[PDB]
């Protein structure tokens, strides 16, 4: 799973798109999404 402040992933990311419980996957850029 994607750790806090890590890239959950935007378009193109096929792995841990799920963020750690409590953190929100925020798609900042279409390809860069971070777990805040």
**DSSP class per residue in 1-36:** -BPTTSB---TT--S--SBPTT--EEESSSS-EEE-
Contacts of 11 (CB under 8 A, 6+ apart): 30, 31
Method: NMR
Q: How far is CA 6 from CA 18, 25, 32, 33, in A?
A: 10, 9, 10, 8
């Amino acid at each position: 799973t994607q750790s806090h402040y890590g890239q959950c992933g935007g378009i193109g990311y096929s792995g841990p798109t799920v963020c750690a419980s409590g953190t929100t996957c925020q798609v900042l850029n279409p390809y860069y999404s971070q777990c805040l």
